[PDB]
Amino acid sequence: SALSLSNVAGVFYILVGGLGLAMMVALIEFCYKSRAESKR
Amino acid sequence: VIDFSKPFMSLGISIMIKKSKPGVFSFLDPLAYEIWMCIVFAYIGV
Structure with missing residues (x-):
């Protein structure tokens, strides 16, 4: 009955x-x- | 001691069972336990 994990795995x-x-x-x-700071 | 005919009715040993009240935490029933656990894990990760 319960909705399984495979139903909502995506x-x-x-x-x-x-x-x-x-x-x-x-x-x-x-x-x-x-990199910008190191250049400046 | 007596002569029987062919069976007019075939039978055997079988199981009579009886022929539910909702549980306290039955509001979790629509989703599986793994779904709830992975929802908690996904919440933590997010």
């Missing part, structure tokens, strides 16, 4: 992928600004 995958993408974007911006 939205979990999407959520974790979005968390990874946000981490990657933030780290890329941090690296870019760190």
